[PDB]
Amino acid sequence: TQRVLPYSNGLYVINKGDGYIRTNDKDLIGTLLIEAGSSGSIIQPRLRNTTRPLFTTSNDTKFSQQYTEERLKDAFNVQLFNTSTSLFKFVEEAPSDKNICIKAYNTYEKYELIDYQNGSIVNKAEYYLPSLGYCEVTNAPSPESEVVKMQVAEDGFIQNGPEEEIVVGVIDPSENIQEINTAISDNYTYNIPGIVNNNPFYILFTVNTTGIYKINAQNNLPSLKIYEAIGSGNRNFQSGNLCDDDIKAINYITGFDSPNAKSYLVVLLNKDKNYYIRVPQTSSNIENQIQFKREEGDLRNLMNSSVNIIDNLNSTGAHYYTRQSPDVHDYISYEFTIPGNFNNKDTSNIRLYTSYNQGIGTLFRVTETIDGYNLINIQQNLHLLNNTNSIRLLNGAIYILKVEVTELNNYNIRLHIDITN
Amino acid sequence: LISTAIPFPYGYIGGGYYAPNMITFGSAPKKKLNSLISSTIPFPYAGY
Secondary structure (H helix, E strand, O other), X not given: OOOOOOOOOEEEEEEEEOOEEEOOOOOEEEEXXXXXXXXXXXXXOOOOOOOOOEEEEOOOOXXXXXXXXXXXXXXXXOOHHHHHOOOEEEEEEOOOOOXXXXXXXXXXXXXXXXXXXXXXXEEEEEEEEEOOOEEEEEEOOOOOOOOOOOOOOOOOEEEXXXXXXXXXXXXXXXXXXXXXXXXXXXXXXXXXXOOXXXXXXXXXXXXXXXXXXXXXXXXXXXOOEEEEEOOOOOOOOOOOEOOOXXXXXXXXXXXXXXXXXXXXXXXXXXXXXXXXXXXXXXXOOOOOEEEEEEOOXXXXXXXXXXXXXXXXXXXXXXXXEEEEOOOOOOEEEEEEEOOOOOOOOXXXXXXXXXXXXXEEEEXXXXXXXXXXXXXXXXXXXXXXEOOOOOEXXXXXXXXXXXXXXXXXXXXXXXXXXXXXX | OOOOXXXXXXOOOOOOOOOOXXXXXXXXXOOOOEOXXXXXXXXXXXXX
């Protein structure tokens, strides 16, 4: 009865909060009994190049401590040495009437490195960075009241700090990064080099003019993924060119991990930002290109989402298609062609519905003109979850359904296109 | 010369010869809350 994680395949670093301590007082600095009217202080000074952290891993060969430290540096730029130069100190003055006790614990900041792949965590590592302590103050426990026998609470952690879960995706270090040194105008074609040689990789690039862009591979194959470099563009700038801040922290925008799904990305890109494009493993030596085209027409009504190209819609009956479901308020698009000859009068009754994830869908008629593609709305506010409503669509026409996931109940989304007549 | 030719001592435990880490001690009670009013000393002072 856990929660569904709509994370794209990759590596993620999660800040789970601060103020963690071990059970059974394993991190208890100690307790001071300050008399009435007096003062007390607990100081935790630290040395240089010290302060051992706490590390566990599910796969030491892959998720080693060095690897986890490098990924943490990629995400938030943490280094163990930084915690070495810090000091913390708790000062408490007891009132005039009664005495006061202060307890001090050494705390930790809990980071988690996860390898998320197809809806599950295949590798998990826990890092605990030495933090700046936790202090609790009580009235003087009057000896003795009583002594009550209790049992240990077993191994575990207790968070005394505020709730926190900051998730940041990081660049896979084993995959190469190729740079487009020139800012992207209305049109460009990247020829994938032979240096990488079929291994999945990233493309770092920026944009000349803010706007909505269509990015695709040849025949929309393979599916591409796009990320935004977090905090990029505030630093060193050159007009019309790319400036790499070596930022590895990325935010997933859209893209399908499945390398076989025919898809193209429509995304709103900013000239003051840097973006990565992940292209997956290609199992052939056949050449391919990444095409970048700024869109000024109706295609801007698909941002930001990957549009899935359906080829097996050539007969009446039942068809359903499974993709990685986007997060809540995140879009996924399907472009399909009703079977039959297009004579502008033959119609087929179409039923569109999802199986588990509820989403609001808007479909568009697509009529490519000499000016480009024209998208015409023909329905809005379609609730796809177990939708029994049907609509008659022209045989041989082209339609694009954009679905916004409003309830995530499954890591996958299944769009069914039932065709009668 | 023999008396003064001590072998070179190794640096701090974490590695280095440059500087200590410092630490704060003391307080003036109070109106004012003199909590940061205190003394500062190098922490190891002999780490070699």
